[PDB]
Each structure stands twice: as C-alpha cells, then as structure tokens.
Amino acid sequence: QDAITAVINSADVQGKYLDTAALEKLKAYFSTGELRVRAATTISANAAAIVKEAVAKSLLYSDITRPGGNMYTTRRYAACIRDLDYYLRYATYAMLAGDPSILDERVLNGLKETYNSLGVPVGATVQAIQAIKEVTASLVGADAGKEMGIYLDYISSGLS
Amino acid sequence: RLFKITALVPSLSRTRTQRELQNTYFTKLVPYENWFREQQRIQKAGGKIIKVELATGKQGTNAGL
C-alpha cells in the first residue's frame, strides 16, 4: 500500500468522498516526494558501502564472528549480509511509499518465527539495524534520515 | 489424442555442466489436452519445433476422439 492508497482506502470504507483533510494528506505527500525520491536515489547509490560500514560498526571483531558465534561460518556471514541488504532495501521501499505496510506484509510477517527457529540472535540484529540507520542518516542528511530511521526503527521494533 | 513431438530447446541461461541432452533434444508423446500449453512452453523458451505428428488420433472426429 501507499500513503495515497491508504488515504483512498480510508475514504473508501466510509463511502466518503475526498474531503479536505484527505486532500491535505495527499498534498503533504506530494510536497515530501521530492526529498523522498532524492533520498531513494542516493541510498540506491551505495547500499553495499552502507552494509559494510554497518557490520564494521556493530558486528565485526565481536564474538559473533568468532567460532561459536552465529556469523562464524562463511555461508552464515553471506546470509547476514543478505539479511541486512533486505532490511535496507525494504526500508527504502517503505520510505518511498510513505507507508510501512510493505514492511508488515513482506518482511515482518514471519520473521521472529524464522529467527527463533534458526537460533539467530535478535539483539545483535537490532543493533545492526541501528548501525544501518545511523550510517544512512549520516549519508542522506537529517531531513530524510528521520524518515529512513522511522521505518528502520519500525523493523527493529517489530523484530523485538 | 496423442501427438508425436520432436523439438530442440537451447540454453539461454548459464551453461550447465550436466547434459540436459534429453532436455535439449527430445522426442516424446504428449496428450492432446496438454499439448497446447506444452508447445507454449517451448514457444516461451525460444526453441525450434522440428516435427509434429498425430500419433493416435484421426482428424475430423466429432465424437469419441
């Protein structure tokens, strides 16, 4: 769903026409879409650098990459990079849509089930998503970093 | 009722280290009902169809197939 599609749905289930508050919501979305698109472009620029900096901030040189940790095996390191790239990409989609429903529908659906099945540590994942959020808020600026951090904190809060 | 097909389908993905020699070049009997979509699959994969032959059926049969 969108913010546009959410506004249309909320006006639809009442049978209501588009009143002035919904037009205010759509015009606010059409105002913010500029920096939304620019932020999505520069996040699509260097996603690999963001994931590299995030694991170098949070996960590297810990016991997690040591033997016994969950990132010791090299296929598990590759799976870690894959999961962080997923979090960043779906946070980019939720930032450009302006509605976190795609995070609820595609990422946060059965994810705690999987992470408790595999024995994946949840707190280290939350700290890695936090480091992702700090790196991309530094990279994109504060004004779009707020909206990026909202959906990354949404993923972090639903994960916990 | 049964078609006798013969078709080749090349590999437009990455190259495979096992044969698929039965899968690249093949000749098989396909029923009349599945033949349209199975042909359409070969149509999709960009492969040439060399030889189509009605094995069992007779043309122009209105009842009893």
């Binding site: 769903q1 599609t5 959410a6 249309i8 749905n9 909320s10 639809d12 289930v13 009442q14 049978g15 209501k16 009143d19 508050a21 205010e24 939350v126 700290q127 936090q130 504060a142 707020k146 951090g149 904190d153 972090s156 809060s157 916990s160 | -």
Partner: protein, 169 residues
C-alpha cells in the same frame, strides 16, 4: 499502552542507548504541542454529549436504511447501543488527543472490534461513516474555541478509520 513520551522510551530502550538530539527534538515538539492539546481536549470534553446527538442526526441523514426495517438502529434498544458506541469513539479519541499517540486507539478500541462486529451482525461501513461525522463536528468545535491548526485533532479519528477499514486496496 504507550504515551508519546513513553513510546520514545521503548524505541530507545530496545537499542540500549541514551537520548540523542533527535528524540529531544520530537520531545520539544510534543512539549510545545501539549498546551494546545489540553485546551482542545477541554473544548471537546465540554460539548461532547451534544456532539453525540448531532452525530446520530447526520448519520441517519446519510443512510436512511439505518433507521428502517432491515437495519441495526431500528428500536430504541438498538439505538442506544449505537449512540453509546459514538460515545466510546469520542472518548478514546480524546484519550488519544491528550496522549498524542494512536496506541490507545490500537490497544483499547480496535483490537477486538472485528470480532464483536462480525459476531453481532453489526456493520462496519456505517460505523466509520459515523466516526467521521463525529470528527467533522469535533473540528468545528475545536476551531470555535481558539486553536487554529487542527491536524492533531484530525488524526486519531482517521487512525480508527484505517484500522476498522475493510481494506480493498
């Protein structure tokens, strides 16, 4: 139930870090919005019982079948229940006005709403329709007594809508 100040505390507690500049920025936003929020809640609290009656009046103006044979607000026994549900939606909207979140509406109103409404045969479309007669009237009352910007009054009724929503897109 989480406040607008306690939801930041939960978001910052799950990461284990201290307060930074951005959380202090949103707390300054909430703290200069609070004086206007209390006045808006007092103005809505004052004339609430008549708001419920006019919301019922315009709700029956919209869809005639609500007060007809094949409807749900047929007798007074079935009318008083629809009017106290109007009372409930206004009450928890004022709760969400002083709290500043939508978590009160989530946790106390919307969570079992589909189960009761499908259980009792109660419709959903006229319910959100009535919720918005309520918020048009509440916007008028807030604009009467002072407060110019009325979007924070505008948001909790719409959040109740979007979760009572039978989503078709």
């Amino acid at each position: 139930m989480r406040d607008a100040v306690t939801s930041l505390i939960k978001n910052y507690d799950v990461a284990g870090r201290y307060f930074d500049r951005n959380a202090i920025d949103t707390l300054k936003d909430y703290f200069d919005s609070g004086t206007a929020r209390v006045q808006a809640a007092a103005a809505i609290n004052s004339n609430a019982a008549a708001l419920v009656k006019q919301a019922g009046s315009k709700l029956f103006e919209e869809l005639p079948e609500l007060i007809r044979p094949g409807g749900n607000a047929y007798t007074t026994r079935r009318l008083a229940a629809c009017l106290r549900d109007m009372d409930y939606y206004l009450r928890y909207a004022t709760y969400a006005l002083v709290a500043g979140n939508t978590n009160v509406l989530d946790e106390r109103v919307l969570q079992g709403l589909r189960e009761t409404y499908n259980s009792l045969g109660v419709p959903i479309g006229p319910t959100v329709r009535g919720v918005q007669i309520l918020k048009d009237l509440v916007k008028e009352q807030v604009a009467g007594a002072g407060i110019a910007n009325t979007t924070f009054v505008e948001e909790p009724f719409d959040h109740i809508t979007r979760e009572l929503s039978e989503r078709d897109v």
